[PDB]
Amino acid sequence: KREGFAENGAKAVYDALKNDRNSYETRAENCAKYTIPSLFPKDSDNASTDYTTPWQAVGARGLNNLASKLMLALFPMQTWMKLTISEFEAKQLVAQPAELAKVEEGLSMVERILMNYIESNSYRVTLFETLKQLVVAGNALLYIPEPEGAYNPMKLYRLSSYVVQRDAFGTVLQIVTLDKTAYAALPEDVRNAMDSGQEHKGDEMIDVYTHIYLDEESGEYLKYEEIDGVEVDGTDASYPVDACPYIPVRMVRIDGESYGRSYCEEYLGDLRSLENLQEAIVKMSMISAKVIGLVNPAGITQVRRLTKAQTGDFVSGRPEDISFLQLEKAADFSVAKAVSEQIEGRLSYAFMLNEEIRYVASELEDTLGGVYSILSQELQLPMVRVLLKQLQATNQIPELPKEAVEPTISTGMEALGRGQDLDKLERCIAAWSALAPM
């Protein structure tokens, strides 16, 4: 029988905490509807409604652009981390250059192993998806698996699939995930475990609950999994607080809350107004009952033949010299267009679709540096800690001295002399020479 947070069961904790999540879910739904609805679809009546395509494209384009730039500050191809040596231990090791050489050859190859593991397991993909979720819903959850086989990418959870509880300092007390799979698809012992009760159909979906909770007589989180209020045997595990494999992430930090907020919440009125204007312009085109045009070269081709009362006669002319005013003729068109330009100005600035010191660094360094550093705290550091412990437990990297060797992220800016020589120059020459005529 369980104790502490787990006393009443994983499903009980899920159904208890679910009540608090509804406002954050509703906000995420509204943000998705005006950007890319498949990022957070929650309408029930999809037999009758679509993932409704807006007339405005601005929301989707801005979201993709912002996620790309955040995935260029975070996790680039250049070295964003450092295994430091503690100065008190460096002061011991420095007494022989051989000891520093033997330590730092290890650190060099281990750091290369970290960047290897990131790229060889294609973490860039799921991290891009995670940034999309953070922009639209403010909240996301990641899991790093224990290693099996040759290739081991992460698993990403949306807000609708999990719950989390926090103290006044933002410390996670417990997490529950709700997971689903069909009866016949589950493992053999799991299928044997459900002999009692109702007779399952082969394609019947089973709700599985994962509960992770903090211990008091140990400095550890504890894990188990649950079906129909009963524990799934063999799923139990324990992790120290410094290296738990589950990582919930917030876009904007608030004290006294389980959850964060999204960025585009502030701008939903603008997006909702822009769509309204675009729909009006479409209908303004459709209802028109007259057409007006012009002939461009000073009237040198004689249009009087068209003012005569004959249908079977033709003006000498070309598509090179004729035009028509099919939208611009309408009376309210120009002001609707103008207001749309103002709204798109605000939105394009907000999604970054843009004295000797350069002031673009206000946005490109100071504005982004905040969320960049906060994701260094709540996303990057836990991931590298888990990765180091996992690589050591699987004998991939050496057991270097725990008091001396410590991780760090180097947010900032990359070297530039190589960059122009490769990207500005030779990649351009390659493209230009490939594109030359036949």
């Binding site: 498949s38 990022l39 993709n64 290739y151 390659a430 493209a431």
Partner: protein, 89 residues
């Protein structure tokens, strides 16, 4: 300058259907489908490049999942006529 050797590699890849990360030659095949420096291959062996694209792009049953396409698709993100070998083929 190495057309017979390139052809032998492509024949072996298509025969064994090595279309997944960590299998042999996967990096070079990726470049042939994505990178402008690959244009001598596109000029020399087009009939094989079409079969390689057929092998690597389609996944039988985000909207990519509904079309039946792999999620490395953002290799082509700023969509353009120069994103793929098709314009030269």
């Amino acid at each position: 300058m190495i057309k017979p050797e390139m052809e032998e590699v492509l024949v072996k890849v298509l025969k064994n259907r090595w279309k997944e990360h960590g299998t042999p030659y996967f990096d070079l095949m990726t470049l042939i489908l994505t990178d402008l420096d690959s244009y001598p291959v596109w000029a020399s062996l087009p009939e094989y490049v079409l079969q390689l694209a057929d092998l690597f792009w389609y996944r039988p049953l985000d909207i990519e999942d509904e079309f039946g396409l792999f999620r490395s698709h953002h290799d082509y993100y700023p969509e353009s006529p120069y994103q793929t070998p098709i314009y030269w083929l």
